[PDB]
Amino acid sequence: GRHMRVLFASLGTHGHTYPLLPLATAARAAGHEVTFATGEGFAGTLRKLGFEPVATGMPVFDGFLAALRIRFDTDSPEGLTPEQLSELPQIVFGRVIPQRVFDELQPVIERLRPDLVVQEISNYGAGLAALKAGIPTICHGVGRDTPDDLTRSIEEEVRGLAQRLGLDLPPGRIDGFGNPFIDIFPPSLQEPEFRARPRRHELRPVPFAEQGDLPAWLSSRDTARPLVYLTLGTSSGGTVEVLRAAIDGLAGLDADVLVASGPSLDVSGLGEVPANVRLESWVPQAALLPHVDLVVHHGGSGTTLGALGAGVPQLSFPWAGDSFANAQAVAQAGAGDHLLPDNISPDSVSGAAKRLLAEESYRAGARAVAAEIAAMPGPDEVVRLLPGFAS
Numbered sequence: 302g303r304h305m306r307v308l309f310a311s312l313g314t315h316g317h318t319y320p321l322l323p324l325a326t327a328a329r330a331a332g333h334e335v336t337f338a339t340g341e342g343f344a345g346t347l348r349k350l351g352f353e354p355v356a357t358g359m360p361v362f363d364g365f366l367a368a369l370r371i372r373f374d375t376d377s378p379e380g381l382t383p384e385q386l387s388e389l390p391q392i393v394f395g396r397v398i399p400q401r402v403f404d405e406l407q408p409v410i411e412r413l414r415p416d417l418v419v420q421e422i423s424n425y426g427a428g429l430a431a432l433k434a435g436i437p438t439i440c441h442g443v444g445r446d447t448p449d450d451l452t453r454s455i456e457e458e459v460r461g462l463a464q465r466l467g468l469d470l471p472p473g474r475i476d477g478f479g480n481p482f483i484d485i486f487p488p489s490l491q492e493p494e495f496r497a498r499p500r501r502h503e504l505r506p507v508p509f510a511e512q513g514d515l516p517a518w519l520s521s522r523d524t525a526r527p528l529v530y531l532t533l534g535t536s537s538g539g540t541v542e543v544l545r546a547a548i549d550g551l552a553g554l555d556a557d558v559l560v561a562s563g564p565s566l567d568v569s570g571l572g573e574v575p576a577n578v579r580l581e582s583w584v585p586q587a588a589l590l591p592h593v594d595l596v597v598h599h600g601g602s603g604t605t606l607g608a609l610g611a612g613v614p615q616l617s618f619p620w621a622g623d624s625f626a627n628a629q630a631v632a633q634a635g636a637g638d639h640l641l642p643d644n645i646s647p648d649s650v651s652g653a654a655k656r657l658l659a660e661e662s663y664r665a666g667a668r669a670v671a672a673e674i675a676a677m678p679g680p681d682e683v684v685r686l687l688p689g690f691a692s
């Protein structure tokens with residue numbers, strides 16, 4: 302089991318791709334040849350890590366357009382109730398993307414002959430492609446198990462797809478296609494049923510280490526003041542309305558506020574902001590978090606786990622994806638708090654943030670999880686299992 306060809310495959314967003322990079326880096330360091338399938342935009346990052354990049358997936362727009370046609374036989378959302386529209390994500394993620402990824406990986410697997418596939422949990426198409434070609438596979442988590450309505454709906458679409466592809470799946474949860482599962486969620490905060498799953502292996506949720514520079518103003522800021530970091534992710538985890546509300550609620554505090562708006566959020570008409578607020582487009586989050594006193598965010602898994610890993614209290618605005626499951630876990634740990642979508646006002650943000658900074662129990666809760674995260678097996682230890690997985 303030396304010099305294996307290992308194919309990693311994730312959905313093409315930062316949140317779905319970054320969590321797999323540490324295991325992939327450890328794999329290469331162990332002497333394996335890493336091919337990494339995800340969005341085309343990650344090619345540069347992947348090459349820098351010494352991986353061979355493969356481009357999979359499609360633009361967000363094309364995904365929802367296909368879902369719209371499939372479900373409602375129309376090209377336009379207009380005239381559709383928000384309830385009807387809420388029927389689309391399960392089709393986008395359980396049917397349309399997996400079909401595309403399954404098809405794209407056919408040629409790749411054929412020519413590469415990988416010894417092992419590492420499939421990111423939400424990238425169902427890659428698991429089907431590996432099943433089809435009979436390649437040993439393991440499933441790599443990105444966050445907490447989420448036994449919620451949306452995931453069950455997505456999984457129903459996946460089973461439907463597998464059946465159409467002539468691939469037999471058991472009834473019931475997809476469960477990583479029954480493969481060994483690499484779980485990066487702090488065990489105490491993981492769903493109890495998932496935590497007891499056979500063939501589950503812990504892996505420390507290492508944040509993505511990028512050699513980028515931190516903003517210069519940080520080096521001369523008055524560190525007697527708290528530093529607050531506000532972000533809404535990279536995948537439409539929030540609206541400009543939410544952002545402005547958060548900025549105005551946080552700007553009041555006696556604190557410095559670093560805002561990272563992300564690539565897919567245009568705030569071009571955001572308005573002027575107080576002097577203690579510094580707007581960045583993108584930052585090396587991993588490198589930043591250890592210097593921060595409060596993380597305010599939409600509740601994405603990467604940022605949730607980064608704040609927990611750094612022992613920093615967090616305030617989230619859970620809205621989409623697994624954000625409610627994260628809020629729940631953070632609440633459980635006493636490591637932060639959240640505001641529901643109806644209760645996001647400068648006043649509500651201000652009060653919550655003041656509380657999270659003043660009450661020492663939140664930092665305590667967060668630091669407890671940081672300790673649990675540090676004791677989890679590191680990529681170099683976990684990577685030693687790959688040969689076994691490929692047998």
Ligand SMILES: Cc1cn([C@H]2C[C@H](O)[C@@H](COP(=O)(O)OP(=O)(O)O)O2)c(=O)[nH]c1=O
Pocket residue numbers: 314315316317319509532533534535536537538561562563564582583584585586587600601602603604605
């Ligand atoms: C917006 C932003 C994100 N990121 C990174 C941090 C996370 O690993 C990832 C965001 O993932 P995550 O926090 O899971 O949110 P979502 O998936 O809902 O977008 O992007 C930055 O490094 N800098 C930034 O400015």
Ligand SMILES: [Cl-]
Pocket residue numbers: 336353355409413
């Ligand atoms: Cl290739």
Ligand SMILES: [Cl-]
Pocket residue numbers: none
């Ligand atoms: Cl060979």
Ligand SMILES: [Cl-]
Pocket residue numbers: 481500501
């Ligand atoms: Cl096993």
Ligand SMILES: [Cl-]
Pocket residue numbers: 511512513
């Ligand atoms: Cl560095």
Ligand SMILES: [Cl-]
Pocket residue numbers: 394423622
């Ligand atoms: Cl998803």
